[PDB]
Amino acid sequence: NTQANVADAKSRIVDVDFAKETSAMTKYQVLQQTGSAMLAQANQLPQVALSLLG
Amino acid sequence: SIKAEMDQLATEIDSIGNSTAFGNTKLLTGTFSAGKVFQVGHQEGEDIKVTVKAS
Amino acid sequence: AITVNTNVTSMKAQKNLNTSNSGLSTSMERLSSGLRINSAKDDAAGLAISNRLNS
Numbered sequence: 707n708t709q710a711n712v713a714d715a716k717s718r719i720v721d722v723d724f725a726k727e728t729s730a731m732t733k734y735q736v737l738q739q740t741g742s743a744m745l746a747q748a749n750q751l752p753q754v755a756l757s758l759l760g
Numbered sequence: 761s762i763k764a765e766m767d768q769l770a771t772e773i774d775s776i777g778n779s780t781a782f783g784n785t786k787l788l789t790g791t792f793s794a795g796k797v798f799q800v801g802h803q804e805g806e807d808i809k810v811t812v813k814a815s
Numbered sequence: 816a817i818t819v820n821t822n823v824t825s826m827k828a829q830k831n832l833n834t835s836n837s838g839l840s841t842s843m844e845r846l847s848s849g850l851r852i853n854s855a856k857d858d859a860a861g862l863a864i865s866n867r868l869n870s
Contacts, residue, residue, distance in 0.1 A: 783867035
């Protein structure tokens with residue numbers, strides 16, 4: 707009996723909850739694609755200087 | 761033994777009442793007994809009143 | 816009114832370009848992170864409230 711209850715206590719501390727973890731993993735995937743598009747588009751900001759005659 | 765169970769359940773009804781808060785403002789301890797005011801328009805008098813009695 | 820020493824048309828045009836460039840920059844960083852209140856430029860009261868809600 708006591709072995710089962712200690713296993714309960716030990717899992718709440720070191721084990722992951724997939725419901726919590728899966729949401730976070732999908733959460734950051736969107737942020738990565740958002741970050742890549744923003745960075746690529748922000749890199750060509752200085753090309754405005756070429757419009758004003760070199 | 762049955763009373764020892766009823767007694768602890770009544771303690772939490774107290775505990776939720778004194779804990780429920782919006783960041784740092786307690787909402788169930790009577791500070792919203794006389795409804796507070798939110799303004800939803802751009803001129804004076806466009807207000808909404810929310811009243812929460814103590815529980 | 817034909818001068819070759821001052822171009823006030825350019826001066827007004829330069830200011831408008833600076834405003835449009837600054838607005839574009841601030842929109843990208845809000846989109847790249849996902850937070851409206853990045854710095855204290857924005858709602859001064861919002862960040863204070865959010866800190867207690869975060870707690």
